């Protein structure tokens, strides 16, 4: 509603795992063909059509935008799960939280190695862009030495 | 699943073992490079000891 009216929105989901569970429950109750982990074959299409609605509209369309921050939980760092794989492949990057770092005291517990933003540095401000250009390399060197 | 996570943690432990062994390799290599100069300085002290 705001995006088409030249304004910027931030939609947070907590969380897609339970939505997938609910869709699975509905399909199995309605006697629909299941698939891997009994999730039907429409789960990927469901998530794709949910997330693709987040976009940066062109200047002639209003200039509005929608940002998507879905949340996903992995059991014992099992990132190979069907839903997690689908959502990771769909999204434009991921932020990975690590229990080890969280317990160690790094709060937030972001794991830079496992976290990425496919968009890149084009979304950073000029000053932030310049600072990050060196900060990223510095952190890489520190990790290599550690 | 349970067996999958068993194998996964086995792999993680092996990777940790590999990293530790790599670190000790680096340490011993540094020590070896430091001590290698003895070759150019040896074989001329025990002349009259013979």
């Amino acid at each position: 509603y705001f995006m088409n009216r030249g304004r910027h929105c931030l939609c947070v989901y907590d969380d897609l795992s339970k939505q997938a569970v609910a869709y699975r429950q509905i399909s199995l109750l309605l006697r629909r063909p299941p698939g891997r982990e009994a999730y039907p074959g429409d789960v990927f299409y469901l998530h794709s059509r949910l997330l693709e609605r987040a976009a940066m509209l062109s200047p002639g369309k209003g200039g509005g935008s929608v940002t998507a921050l879905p949340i996903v939980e992995t059991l014992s760092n099992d990132v190979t799960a069907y839903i997690v794989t689908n959502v990771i492949s769909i999204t434009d990057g991921q932020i990975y939280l690590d229990t080890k770092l969280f317990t160690g005291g790094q709060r937030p517990a972001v794991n830079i190695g496992l976290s990425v933003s496919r968009v890149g540095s084009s979304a950073q401000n000029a000053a932030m862009k310049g600072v990050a250009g060196k900060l990223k390399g510095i952190l890489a060197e520190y990790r290599k030495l550690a | 699943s349970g067996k999958l996570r068993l194998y996964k943690e086995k792999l993680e432990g092996y990777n940790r073992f590999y990293s530790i062994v790599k670190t000790i390799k680096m340490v011993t290599l540094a020590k070896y490079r430091a001590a290698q100069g003895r070759i150019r300085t040896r074989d001329f002290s025990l002349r009259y000891t013979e």
């Binding site: 030249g6 062109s58 200047p59 002639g60 | -």
Partner: protein, 166 residues
């Protein structure tokens, strides 16, 4: 006079005079922002004149809205507009915009921001207006005389264990 094509080569409407008139007729600069949004929706990208008119509306407007809004700042709004114009539209601000910013800083009494804008105008534009510079200096001297040169808790002396970290 000359057609402008969008990112994909489609032309755009360069006639922005009605929107400029609407902006000048607005009351609260949030309405001017809404007008800019409507222009973007209608494919009439704002121009330098439109941005300067928006800045004038901000300067001459009573407040952000009919009802008070906490921590509102005309200076912050105008700086955000300038960033949007320069970075996301590739349009260099003119001296009129900087003069409006300096006028707003002087009216607010923010002598430090006035100094910074004066330096920016000297660097990019052809100097800062003498009247505005003198007004900023007078405001700074008045604050110094009255004792409001700097905050109070900053001047307050605190030891290592005295800082009351909340």
């Amino acid at each position: 006079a000359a057609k402008k094509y969008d990112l994909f080569g489609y032309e755009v409407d360069t006639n922005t005079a009605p929107w400029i008139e609407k902006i000048k007729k607005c009351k609260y600069y949030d309405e001017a922002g809404e007008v800019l949004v409507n222009m973007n929706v209608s494919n009439c990208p704002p121009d330098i004149a439109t941005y300067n008119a928006t800045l004038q509306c901000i300067y001459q407007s009573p407040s952000k809205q009919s009802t008070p809004v906490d921590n509102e700042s005309k200076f912050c709004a105008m700086m955000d507009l300038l960033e949007e114009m320069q970075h996301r539209n590739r349009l260099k601000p003119n001296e009129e915009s900087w003069t409006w910013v300096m006028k707003e800083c002087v009216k607010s009494g923010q002598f430090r921001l006035g100094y910074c804008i004066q330096q920016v105008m000297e660097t990019e534009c052809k100097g800062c207006p003498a009247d505005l510079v003198k007004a900023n200096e007078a405001n700074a001297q008045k604050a110094k005389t009255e004792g409001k040169e700097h905050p109070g808790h900053l001047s307050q002396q605190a030891g290592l264990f005295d800082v009351k970290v909340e």
